[PDB]
Amino acid sequence: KTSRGEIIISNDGHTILKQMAILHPVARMLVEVSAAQDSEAGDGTTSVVILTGALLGAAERLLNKGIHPTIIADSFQSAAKRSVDILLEMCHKVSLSDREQLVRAASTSLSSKIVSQYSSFLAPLAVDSVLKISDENSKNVDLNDIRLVKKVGGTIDDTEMIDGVVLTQTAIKSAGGPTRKEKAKIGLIQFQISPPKPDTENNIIVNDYRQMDKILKEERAYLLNICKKIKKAKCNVLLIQKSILRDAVNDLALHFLSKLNIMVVKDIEREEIEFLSKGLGCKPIADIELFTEDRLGSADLVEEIDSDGSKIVRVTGIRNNNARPTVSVVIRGANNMIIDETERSLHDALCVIRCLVKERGLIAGGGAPEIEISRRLSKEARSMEGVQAFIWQEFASALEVIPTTLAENAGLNSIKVVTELRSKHENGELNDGISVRRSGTTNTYEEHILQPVLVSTSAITLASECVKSILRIDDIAFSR
Amino acid sequence: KKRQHGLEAKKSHILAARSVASIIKTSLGPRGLDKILISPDGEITITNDGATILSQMELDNEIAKLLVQLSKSQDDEIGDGTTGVVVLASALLDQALELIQKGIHPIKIANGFDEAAKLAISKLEETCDDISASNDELFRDFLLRAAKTSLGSKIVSKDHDRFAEMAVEAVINVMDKDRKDVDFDLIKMQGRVGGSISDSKLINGVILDKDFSHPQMPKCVLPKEGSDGVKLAILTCPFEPPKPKTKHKLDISSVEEYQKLQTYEQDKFKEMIDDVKKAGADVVICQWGFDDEANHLLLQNDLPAVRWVGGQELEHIAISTNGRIVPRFQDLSKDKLGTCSRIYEQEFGTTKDRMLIIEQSKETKTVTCFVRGSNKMIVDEAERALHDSLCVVRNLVKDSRVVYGGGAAEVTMSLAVSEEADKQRGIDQYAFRGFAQALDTIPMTLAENSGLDPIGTLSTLKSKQLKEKISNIGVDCLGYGSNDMKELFVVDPFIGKKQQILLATQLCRMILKIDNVIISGK
Amino acid sequence: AENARLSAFVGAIAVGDLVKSTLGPKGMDKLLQSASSNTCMVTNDGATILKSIPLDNPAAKVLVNISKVQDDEVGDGTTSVTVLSAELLREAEKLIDQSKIHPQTIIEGYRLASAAALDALTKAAVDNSHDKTMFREDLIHIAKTTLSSKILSQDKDHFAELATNAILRLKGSTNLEHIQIIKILGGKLSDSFLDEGFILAKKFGNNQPKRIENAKILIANTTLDTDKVKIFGTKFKVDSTAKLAQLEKAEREKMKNKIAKISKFGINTFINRQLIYDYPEQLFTDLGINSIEHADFEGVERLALVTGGEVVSTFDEPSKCKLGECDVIEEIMLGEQPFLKFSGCKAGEACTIVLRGATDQTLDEAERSLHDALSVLSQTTKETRTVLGGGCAEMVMSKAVDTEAQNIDGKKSLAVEAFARALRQLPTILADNAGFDSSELVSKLRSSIYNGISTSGLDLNNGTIADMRQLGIVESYKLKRAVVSSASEAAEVLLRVDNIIRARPR
Amino acid sequence: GEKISGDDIRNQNVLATMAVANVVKSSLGPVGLDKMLVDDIGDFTVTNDGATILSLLDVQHPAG
């Protein structure tokens, strides 16, 4: 519960630490760790967030040894670099474009909250979203091209990704004359339709009572002449930006467009115009002088879906195909709480494949990387014969804290799982991990338990960076 | 009243004493440091003793009573090397915190300690040596080797040769020729503040704060004409002119009856001094005061006397002089006279109060070490340090087995329990190893105060004890270099480490079983 | 002496003991937690530490001003400036009180010691100058001395090649505004890139192409926000809205005439100081010209040094002024927000260094490292003399101070020797953070210089005495003279205080 | 801020939801009866519909 009364129920580590009130100076820097995990990884935050406080138990045990923090910090730096090379040896070869692999790999991040029951329909929507927007050259693939539409009502089973421009805001609805728009041009209006009102002082000298209504006739004619060129261009769909700023709109603009059967929508953010201009390809119109038919786009049909009282505008088809299309999906949920649960759930699936495009490597998680790295570390740590032998070995003992927590959080005995892990991973092959459904250890490939290598690399990097910043502070001083 | 359930009272309750016991951790070994504890009455007691601090210290959590209850039995059982033992008593509860996080049941943690405790003692019985197999001369040589490491612990360890002959010669006076016996009850050490700490001598007897009254004679008479022990005597009944103690009334019907009451005490004044002079007893101790008119005649008949002597010191005098304190004036006889070799009053300071000293040069039942020092605070600390030496020799008497000290015992049994843990397997393999892991913290803590690498020394111990089974290699507390304890004459009693570790293990079994804490006011 | 100076000695030492852990390359960083705004900052340099900490002692506030002097002149290793003055206050607690010597005489002993200290710094200086071949190659190792005092030293070898090529592109530029430092969240310190050009954190327009070759960039200070602001106290007097609607619309064409004057230049890129309305923004799309806006003040100034252009307000003449040209202006997205990457500048007038780090505290703090390191490179070009650091310079001066004490003799030798003993405590404090033996390392270094070996020094990595020339420890004479001369005169004023006057708070 | 962990949260949440639930259970079935709510602002509505009552009722613990 925030100071304003906002209630947020989630297990997300980045969301909890965002509104968490921390009175400890060093612990306030732990929020930055969760901020970097969302920017770099951005997927499986519930599993990654444990690395923030996992090394705290290992660093506390080393304080009694009297070892200088720089030696402890530098030992974690080399241990992190060696841990990355270990993850690169066990990765699986995965093609860039595929079908079942993207569904199987993302299904690990798709299932966290109870909403995973409806994730069967979310997997085709998450894969096709990246399948449409992507590049074979492994680019950054900005997630801003995929917009999440939040609508109250319905169920997640009704969630469907729209193949064309979608509008969240509705029209004024006062006139509401036209019930549909098809085979009409869709324009983008960056200006507003209002009687002229310059920012400077405006003094209109009226010497005759007939000039009053004449000014009204001029306001009707000046604003209609703009609509005359729009009607001449056969554009029945107009998009106006936020109308609460300055000019807004008069009440006579409805009867002008209703007679011409032209639909108009307002209160659109400036950032939304840039998003809609990419997919639709329509050149925005900043004034009536530059307004023409070449800048206007076109569409086959525009249907307004009305469900549970909430109306939404959907555009089908794209006339001019550009090199930067955009896609969007309409999230249907009972309340904003479930919508926020699906919001963070869809952020994970988009980050999983995005890391697979940059790095095609894939490694099986769920207890596998923690024991494999600790085995190759403490074994090589004994050959150091020095301060690095008593640190990396203790750091390898901190890697089993994650599967120990996963066992206790699942109700299973911790040692009983670790005994099965330590015995199997001794020799070891691959794919061996913790299974919560079967209550034991089995193949994680068939259990849909995986994780990208780039995510695991960025997770251990930020985990190693977290202990560096904690050990970087040698004293607590209260400044002014 | 607060509501505590789950890990709240199953962890912080143990973590409480964990932070409290870590305070005295810096006092472990001769390299330790002292502490200051202010009593609730305002007095200040400065000592490093783990049992003395925790006794007078007032804490909050009720676990403090569990630590004091153990120290009560340790004093009557072993009570040897308290500064060394008090640290390892709480080391068993620190390892149990790690097994709880691993998912082991708390009772399975407690029951796993008693299983590995019996096997660790059997391993220590391999390297133990028998001191009783030698003669009395070599036994006293073994005491001198032990008094170096064992006796010297706390401060004043600067010069250990002054108190070396004090503890050795104390158990020589009272002992059996077959070397089976102990009496620590008749040995009491009463020290004073003065002179230097190196002025301590061996004087068998008691030191009385009360001197000879009526300063009209000599402070001390060394010889005696009658010889035969100066004829020491003590009157149990108070010394007063005889009168009925019960309620009574006097009826004087004539002046003659009043005059007879005048000669009443006058006849008793001569009767009491003649009965003592007839026996020829020089030393006569009156328990409660004495008569003012008799304060002279005692000197007139040469009868030194004292007043207001505690009953506790009177018991040590009668057993030392082999006499019997006189219960009644009519029962006074020469058969109850004691034997005192020499008696004198110490000059002490300039004036102050002269301390009467009774001394027996020959064999006597009451053994006492003459102790003087400049510092007043070191008095109670140095006495209790040598008071534990009475139980040190007792451990060498009742138990003829002696093991090499220096923390080498816990390292020796560490390799045995590690091998015995693999026979049971199951979940007890980590539980049995955890019991030996807690004992491995003792060597690492010894090197903490000395500035030596805890693991670097411990790694050499197990590596050296692997090739040779001799236990003489142990942790070096004082920085003697090479870790051989045979050349350094470092030995510890077998029963000392046995019971103190076993009784601590038996107590921690019921401590880990605590779930809810209910506290009610007195 | 007693009640006159009480907290001026111990209070100043207690402040230096807090930053004692921050001195040296093996030291650690202190956390500054402000009681207001609930913010925090992690900095090694005492300039920010001493500024934000409440100081009850007026003598401690004086240490802030002398810290600001070394902050601008040097900026790195400024902790030893106030610590050296704190040791002079400790020795003054004895000679003034115990030995009973007037404070001015103790000051005079430091005055003659300051003159003898300047003679030891000049004679021991090493001249590196003339040919820039071996000079620039030595700047790699010379910079590494003061480059990283932090826990970030893993970036030393990486930033050593970037800092060396930074001054190479400047070609003798002594202005610190000609270099561009970019702070980017995420990544590692080894991921820092250095290219010839500038990278802006802004973006292009909606329809602006992502790649443009041989583009001509031109900036300006004008305001495209809307209409025309004209002069103050204006107004519109019209008969009706027929003329009013034309006046507002015509000025959109009047600004297009100014944009038509821009098209006469033939520039492929335009940059405005203030915001731009949508209509003049779309006119730039018809002409195929990029647009950049939202630059408060330094936004247009930092790009003018890189492109080598000039602000043109009038747009009147396509002949005079300046026309900048960049080979490839293509927008390159780095991290999250898209960035504008420029390449192929017309000249080497400026340069840009890109830094990447995971922690935001590392970006702000390491910015001062490269900012101070480039100042050192400019001083090594101007001042041709350099010295050797790493604890050796303090023992060399101690040899000259002890030599002058034999000539002066008298009772002032107690103050002269105390100045030498104060110079002996600095390497003790310098080696205190590493946790090695002080009596072992100082005795080997102090006795070796008396034997005629000036190349030795304290090595805190291996914990022994090693050659400072082999390890690459080199300090310029400008850095060494500024620290010693200021710290010697810093405590000179603190010893002149015979009374404490506390004013009534407001 | 104020943070409590363990069963204390789940116990106070169930007891809070059960207390306000037992108030509307009297309207169950044809034999149910309406109840009155005092808004302290001067407005009152007597109905058995839980949609309006739960909207008018001030929720103490955020779990309600």
In this complex, which chains have at least 3 CB pairs below 8 Å with chain B?
A
d(Cα C94, Cα C419) in Å, to the nearest integer? Answer: 13
Phi, psi torsion values for A203, nearest 5 degrees: -120, 115
CB pairs under 8 A between A and D: 3
Q: What is the CATH number of the domain that holds C3?
A: 1.10.560.10
Q: Which amino acid is at D12?
A: Q
A7 CB neighbours in chain D (<8 A) are 62
A215 CB neighbours in chain C (<8 A) are 240-241
Instruction: Please report, for residues B120, B509, C354, D9, the alpha-carbon distance to residue B10 in angstroms, rounded to integers and kept in the order given.
Output: 28, 13, 54, 21
Residue C493: count of CB within 10 angstroms of its CB: 13
d(Cα A433, Cα A443) in Å, to the nearest integer? Answer: 7
Q: Write down the H helix ranges in A298-367.
A: 336-358
The pair of structure tokens assigned to B185 is 């009850």
Query: Could you tell me if B240 and B356 lie in one domain?
Result: yes
**Closest alpha carbon to C90 in C15, C157, C160:** C15
- Specify which residues B235 forms β-bridges with: B286, B326
Q: Phi-psi category of B243—alpha, beta or left, where left has phi over 0 and alpha has psi -120 to 50?
A: beta
Which of C30, C54, C279 has the CB atom closest to A475's CB atom? C30
Query: Could you tell me if C136 and C102 lie in one domain?
Result: no
Catalytic residues of C: 45, 78-79, 372
Q: Total structural domains in chain A?
A: 3
Report the residue of B95, B105, B427 to disrupt the A interface, i.e. the one with the largest count of A CBs within 10 Å: B427
D62/A21 Cβ within 8 A: no
Query: Could you tell me if A258 and A336 lie in one domain?
Result: no
Chains D and C touch (3+ CB pairs under 8 A): no
Spacing of C-alpha C478 from chain mean position: 15
Chains C and B touch (3+ CB pairs under 8 A): no
Last residue of a domain, one of A316, A345, A360: A360
Query: Could you tell me if C141 and C233 lie in one domain?
Result: no
D1/A7 Cβ within 8 A: no
A390/B103 Cβ within 8 A: no
Spacing of C-alpha A122 from chain mean position: 15
Q: Which amino acid is at B250?
A: L
Nearest-Cα distance to chain A for D33, in Å, is: 30
The residue of chain A with its CA nearest to that of B454 is A65
Query: Could you tell me if A177 and A311 lie in one domain?
Result: yes
Query: Could you tell me if A385 and A246 lie in one domain?
Result: no
Q: Which residues 1-30 on chain D approach chain A with CB closer than 8 angstroms?
A: 1
Among candidate residues B52, B83, B368, B445, the one labeled active-site is: B83
Query: Could you tell me if A153 and A175 lie in one domain?
Result: no
C358/A70 Cβ within 8 A: no
Query: Could you tell me if A90 and A126 lie in one domain?
Result: no
- Way the structure was solved: cryo-EM
Q: Total structural domains in chain B?
A: 3
CB B234 within 8 A of CB B315: no
Which residue's structure tokens are 């003395």? B52
DSSP secondary structure code for residue C19 in this structure: S
Q: Phi-psi category of B32—alpha, beta or left, where left has phi over 0 and alpha has psi -120 to 50?
A: beta
> 3-state class of C215 per DSSP?
strand
Q: Write down the H helix ranges in C154-198.
A: 156-170
What is the separation, in whole angstroms, between the first and last Cα of chain A?
Answer: 30
d(Cα B453, Cα B464) in Å, to the nearest integer? Answer: 17
For chain C, the residue count is 506
Query: Could you tell me if B186 and B308 lie in one domain?
Result: no
Query: Could you tell me if B156 and B223 lie in one domain?
Result: no
The residue of chain A with its CA nearest to that of B430 is A415
Which of A65, A390, A415 has the CB atom closest to B102's CB atom? A415
B455/A414 Cβ within 8 A: no
d(Cα C245, Cα A204) in Å, to the nearest integer? Answer: 12
The residue of chain B with its CA nearest to that of A413 is B103
d(Cα B233, Cα B318) in Å, to the nearest integer? Answer: 8
Nearest-Cα distance to chain A for B457, in Å, is: 14
Among candidate residues B80, B388, B428, B492, the one labeled active-site is: B388
The pair of structure tokens assigned to B248 is 């009574």
For chain B, the residue count is 522
Last residue of a domain, one of B341, B364, B387: B364
In this complex, which chains have at least 3 CB pairs below 8 Å with chain D?
A
The pair of structure tokens assigned to C40 is 């925090």
Nearest-Cα distance to chain B for A384, in Å, is: 14
Query: Could you tell me if A314 and A176 lie in one domain?
Result: yes
Query: Could you tell me if C290 and C331 lie in one domain?
Result: yes
Angle at A340 between CA A339 and CA A341, to 5 degrees: 90
Strand order in the sheet with C331-333: C199-200, C338-341, C331-333
Which residue's structure tokens are 């936004």? C299
For A17, residues 6+ apart whose C-beta sits below 8 A from its C-beta are A30, A31, A34, A49
- State the DSSP H helix or E strand holding residue A88, giving kind and residue range, or none if neither: helix A69-89
C237–A contact, CB cutoff 8 A? yes
Report the residue of C230, C239, C254 to disrupt the A interface, i.e. the one with the largest count of A CBs within 10 Å: C239
> 3-state class of B242 per DSSP?
coil
Which residue's structure tokens are 């964990």? B18
Q: What is the CATH number of the domain that holds C295?
A: 3.50.7.10
d(Cα B131, Cα B128) in Å, to the nearest integer? Answer: 10
Query: Could you tell me if C34 and C85 lie in one domain?
Result: yes
CB C186 within 8 A of CB C347: no
Nearest-Cα distance to chain A for C336, in Å, is: 7
- State the DSSP H helix or E strand holding residue A61, giving kind and residue range, or none if neither: helix A50-63
- Specify which residues C476 forms β-bridges with: C386
Query: Could you tell me if C368 and C245 lie in one domain?
Result: no
Query: Could you tell me if A84 and A206 lie in one domain?
Result: no
The residue of chain A with its CA nearest to that of B100 is A414
Query: Could you tell me if A366 and A479 lie in one domain?
Result: yes
Nearest-Cα distance to chain A for D22, in Å, is: 25
CA dihedral D32, D37, D43, D45 (to 10 degrees): -10
Residue B350: count of CB within 10 angstroms of its CB: 5
Query: Could you tell me if B358 and B212 lie in one domain?
Result: yes
A140 CB neighbours in chain C (<8 A) are 333
Which sign does the torsion angle of CA C107, C113, C118, C121 carry? negative
**Closest alpha carbon to B341 in B319, B358, B366:** B358
- Specify which residues C355 forms β-bridges with: C183
- Specify which residues A473 forms β-bridges with: C29
Nearest-Cα distance to chain D for A221, in Å, is: 49
d(Cα B22, Cα B28) in Å, to the nearest integer? Answer: 10
Query: Could you tell me if A333 and A386 lie in one domain?
Result: no
Q: Which amino acid is at C189?
A: L
d(Cα B46, Cα B376) in Å, to the nearest integer? Answer: 10
A219 CB neighbours in chain C (<8 A) are 241
How buried is C345 (Cβ within 10 angstroms: 0-12 exposed, 13-18 middle, 19+ buried)? buried
Last residue of a domain, one of C269, C304, C338: C338
Q: What is the CATH number of the domain that holds B509?
A: 1.10.560.10
- State the DSSP H helix or E strand holding residue C115, giving kind and residue range, or none if neither: helix C103-123
CB B51 within 8 A of CB B69: no
Q: Total structural domains in chain C?
A: 3
The boundaries of the domain holding residue C357 are: 128-204+339-383
Q: In angstroms, what is the resolution?
A: 5.6
How buried is B225 (Cβ within 10 angstroms: 0-12 exposed, 13-18 middle, 19+ buried)? exposed
D1 CB neighbours in chain A (<8 A) are 21
DSSP secondary structure code for residue A285 in this structure: B
> 3-state class of B359 per DSSP?
strand
Which of B103, B427, B455 has the CB atom closest to A408's CB atom? B103
DSSP secondary structure code for residue C335 in this structure: S
d(Cα B403, Cα B125) in Å, to the nearest integer? Answer: 9
d(Cα B178, Cα B175) in Å, to the nearest integer? Answer: 9
The boundaries of the domain holding residue A247 are: 164-324
Nearest-Cα distance to chain D for A341, in Å, is: 17
Query: Could you tell me if C223 and C104 lie in one domain?
Result: no
Query: Could you tell me if B9 and B58 lie in one domain?
Result: yes
> 3-state class of B358 per DSSP?
strand
CB A461 within 8 A of CB C188: yes
Query: Could you tell me if B37 and B88 lie in one domain?
Result: yes
Query: Could you tell me if A46 and A121 lie in one domain?
Result: no
Query: Could you tell me if A272 and A329 lie in one domain?
Result: no
Query: Could you tell me if C200 and C345 lie in one domain?
Result: yes
> 3-state class of A147 per DSSP?
strand
CB pairs under 8 A between A and C: 164
Query: Could you tell me if B144 and B29 lie in one domain?
Result: no
Query: Could you tell me if A304 and A210 lie in one domain?
Result: yes
Query: Could you tell me if B370 and B316 lie in one domain?
Result: no
| C154-161, long-range: CB < 8 A, 24+ apart | C154/A74, C154/A77, C154/C189, C154/C190, C155/C189, C155/C190, C155/C192, C155/C366, C158/C189, C158/C190, C158/C192, C159/C189, C159/C192, C159/C369, C159/C370
Which string of DSSP letters, residue by residue, matches B185-225? SS-----EE-S-GGG-EE--S-EES---SSSSS-S-----S
The pair of structure tokens assigned to C307 is 């492109």
Q: What is the CATH number of the domain that holds B150?
A: 3.30.260.10
Q: Is B388 a catalytic residue?
A: yes
Phi, psi torsion values for B96, nearest 5 degrees: -65, -20
| Angle, helices B428-439/B91-101, rounded to nearest 10 degrees | 150
C241/A286 Cβ within 8 A: no
Instruction: Please report, for residues A20, A48, A355, the alpha-carbon distance to residue A43 in angstroms, rounded to integers and kept in the order given.
Output: 21, 8, 9
D42–A contact, CB cutoff 8 A? no
The pair of structure tokens assigned to A278 is 């990419």
A65 CB neighbours in chain B (<8 A) are 454
Last residue of a domain, one of A333, A360, A387: A360
Query: Could you tell me if B323 and B238 lie in one domain?
Result: yes
CB C441 within 8 A of CB C431: yes
Residue C130: count of CB within 10 angstroms of its CB: 9
Nearest-Cα distance to chain C for A437, in Å, is: 36
The residue of chain A with its CA nearest to that of C281 is A286
d(Cα B17, Cα B33) in Å, to the nearest integer? Answer: 20
Which string of DSSP letters, residue by residue, matches B403-428? EE-SSHHHHHHHHHHHHHHHHH-TTH
Query: Could you tell me if B186 and B242 lie in one domain?
Result: no
Catalytic residues of A: 12, 45-46, 348
DSSP secondary structure code for residue C130 in this structure: S
The boundaries of the domain holding residue B303 are: 205-364
Among candidate residues B47, B52, B80, B82, the one labeled active-site is: B82
B430/A414 Cβ within 8 A: no
CA dihedral B442, B448, B452, B455 (to 10 degrees): 50
Query: Could you tell me if B425 and B325 lie in one domain?
Result: no
Q: What is the CATH number of the domain that holds A51?
A: 1.10.560.10
For chain A, the residue count is 480
Which stretches of B347-502 are assigned E, i.e. beta strand?
Answer: 355-359, 369-370, 372-373, 401-404, 491-493
Query: Could you tell me if B217 and B347 lie in one domain?
Result: yes
